[PDB]
Scaffold this active site. Sequence first.
Site, short mmCIF file in Angstrom:
data_model
loop_
_atom_site.label_atom_id
_atom_site.label_comp_id
_atom_site.label_asym_id
_atom_site.label_seq_id
_atom_site.Cartn_x
_atom_site.Cartn_y
_atom_site.Cartn_z
N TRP A 91 62.70 65.01 38.29
CA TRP A 91 62.30 66.39 38.59
C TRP A 91 63.20 66.98 39.65
CZ3 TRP A 91 60.40 67.93 34.58
CH2 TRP A 91 59.55 67.11 33.81
N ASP A 157 58.72 70.84 45.83
CA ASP A 157 58.03 70.74 44.58
C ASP A 157 56.92 69.72 44.72
OD1 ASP A 157 57.14 70.15 42.03
OD2 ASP A 157 59.15 69.65 41.22
N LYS A 181 48.49 68.17 36.82
CA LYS A 181 48.30 66.77 37.26
C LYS A 181 46.97 66.58 38.00
CE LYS A 181 52.94 67.14 36.61
NZ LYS A 181 52.80 66.44 35.30
C1 LIG Z 1 57.11 66.56 40.35
C2 LIG Z 1 57.19 67.36 39.08
N1 LIG Z 1 57.99 68.45 39.07
C3 LIG Z 1 58.13 69.23 37.99
C4 LIG Z 1 57.45 68.99 36.78
C5 LIG Z 1 57.66 69.90 35.59
O1 LIG Z 1 56.43 70.57 35.30
P1 LIG Z 1 56.32 71.72 34.16
O2 LIG Z 1 56.01 71.01 32.85
O3 LIG Z 1 55.13 72.41 34.82
O4 LIG Z 1 57.65 72.46 34.10
C6 LIG Z 1 56.53 67.85 36.66
C7 LIG Z 1 55.86 67.59 35.38
O5 LIG Z 1 55.21 66.56 35.23
C8 LIG Z 1 56.40 66.99 37.87
O6 LIG Z 1 55.59 65.89 37.86
CL LIG Z 2 60.85 61.98 38.98
#
Ligand SMILES: Cc1ncc(COP(=O)(O)O)c(C=O)c1O
Ligand SMILES: [Cl-]
Lengths: 346, 349
Positions: A91, A157, A181
Amino acid sequence: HNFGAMAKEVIEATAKAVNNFWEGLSILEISHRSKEWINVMNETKALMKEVMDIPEGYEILFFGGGASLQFLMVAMNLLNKKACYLDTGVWASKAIKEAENIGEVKIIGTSKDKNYTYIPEYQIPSDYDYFHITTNNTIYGTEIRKDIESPIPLVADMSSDILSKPIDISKYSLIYAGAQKNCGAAGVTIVIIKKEILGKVQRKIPIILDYQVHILNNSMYNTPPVISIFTVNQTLKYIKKIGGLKKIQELNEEKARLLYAEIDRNKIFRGTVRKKDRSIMNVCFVMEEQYKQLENEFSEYALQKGIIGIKGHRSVGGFRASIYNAVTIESVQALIKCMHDFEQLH
Amino acid sequence: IHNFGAMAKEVIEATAKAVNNFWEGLSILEISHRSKEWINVMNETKALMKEVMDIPEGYEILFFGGGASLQFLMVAMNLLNKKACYLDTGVWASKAIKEAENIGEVKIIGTSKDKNYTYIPEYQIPSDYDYFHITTNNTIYGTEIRKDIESPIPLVADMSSDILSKPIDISKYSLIYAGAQKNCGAAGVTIVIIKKEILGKVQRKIPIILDYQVHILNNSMYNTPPVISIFTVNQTLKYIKKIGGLKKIQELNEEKARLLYAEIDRNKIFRGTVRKKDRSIMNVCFVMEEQYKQLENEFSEYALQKGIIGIKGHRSVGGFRASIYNAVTIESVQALIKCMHDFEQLHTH
Ligand SMILES: Cc1ncc(COP(=O)(O)O)c(C=O)c1O
Ligand SMILES: [Cl-]
Ligand SMILES: Cc1ncc(COP(=O)(O)O)c(C=O)c1O
Ligand SMILES: [Cl-]
């Protein structure tokens, strides 16, 4: 059987609201322009302020889509010359890339060298526009511990750890979370933002991507994701009922502590991640090398015993137990008992 | 009570049921979107939309969080290379145009701004623009487009206020999109139906999250999709099929509009804002005759006492707007008509 659970109060309230939200009308059929809805928006905002202790000067916004839309929005709204990022996972890496498509990014530290099994060291340079981190790295099961005190605006994030514990909001200039989540249901992303950081970018920003336009319209510049916002509203009510983020933390810390003890005790299994950087939310563990060939055999065994969705993301293989707030101590014990029995057969 | 807003009841019940128990005790709010149960819904929704709308081969179906406004920007970023053209028929059309102008060159080839968008202008589509964008139902002014449009360049269309109200010839379009809180589903999802061969022809860099190709490559799960809103679209499509398709849905709507316009025209208290031939069958706009101008507020209150809700016009027009979405019943329309007819401020017998 059990492993992505949402609290039951929140499910029931949501169902109720679909049948009859107000005066016979389903929450799916009321207008988002109506006062009934505007009130929910505002109460949800006041609830998040309360439950998270958000100080003055921070705006709360709700966006459709996910954390990925924010990868872009963050950069478009704050990257004027250059910004810096910490590379602690998939991420974090995807944020970095989106930002790189907008302007100059310095990656000031990475753990890519060891399959992100640890959180690197870094020195935050004082002349970048902002510093972006990913606080819980969902795929690799690392999280950040050090209390971070940035000399430039700190963006984070928190998709995988928002509402798992109390945080010092004042340390951050912008926090965001895709909400599927903990925190809520798929379809909404939360942004908590220190307004005074906006307005400092020479590049043009599309209207739909401009945080100021959203702030001015209280997140209803256009149609917001009503039902997902409602589930956030309830989740906040439940966290408050059950005694706040202090308590939510204790229950989580415990659940993780038991599971890591089982992983470390059990000779079938080992945690992937360095002990000190272990995430409380996403618990990654693989087969010991000696028992490597049993990997698939154990998945099937867990499934037979009613444990679901613990398969790791591809890149790591092995396993990952996502111990979100709503996953019960009992579901964690049945994993432990499944792991324990697996060991005792072999 | 009579409801301008209503969703079909089968769809509400199915959604509620799915929140309690979608699969093996698990709520739809708690299943993984990476699970096979969900993927199957994604695909069945896609196959349903294909069936019910007669979408030909070569078109992809995508589901986006957010609304039509995100698509204003995506459209332009994905297809405006040099220049594009737009028809200005209203607020939504004008907002699309503006977002597109922030990306590159836009020719507005026709506008009805001159008469408060009460009619649909004439226009000639130039052959050397990258695409031509229209808004087929102009929600705030109550105009819709009738002429069967055959564009020599790719035709993009915002059908937020009329998708699933009637059958359309999908092959005429290269990209269709709809925020989905008006007929087709619940707030939180936007549908995009796209002729894939139009992508790839832009020199500008496109952010990954805004790139339709990245979405298509991942079947709209490049990232977390809006699961529950997508489910409501899935049910709405099942209901439309049960009751006999978009042909039937159209007849019922055409009727509902026909009655209401007849009442608007018959009644001396009221007048339709919009030119007769361009009248929308979805959003029915009417104001007080000038003689009765001061009664505007008195009538709102009178409708409200009689159980009619949400007919107030957007600010720019004032007056009233009855949004006759698919799920609004003939009976709710008659009670509006009966409410209007009880214009004994005149003493007609
Ligand atoms: C830490 C983190 N950042 C970003 C995301 C991306 O999320 P989205 O599907 O809301 O774009 C996730 C998805 O599981 C995540 O766990
Ligand atoms: Cl990750
Ligand atoms: C024709 C039209 N386009 C665009 C929009 C904006 O859609 P969203 O609110 O989903 O951004 C609307 C909202 O009603 C609309 O009616
Ligand atoms: Cl309009």
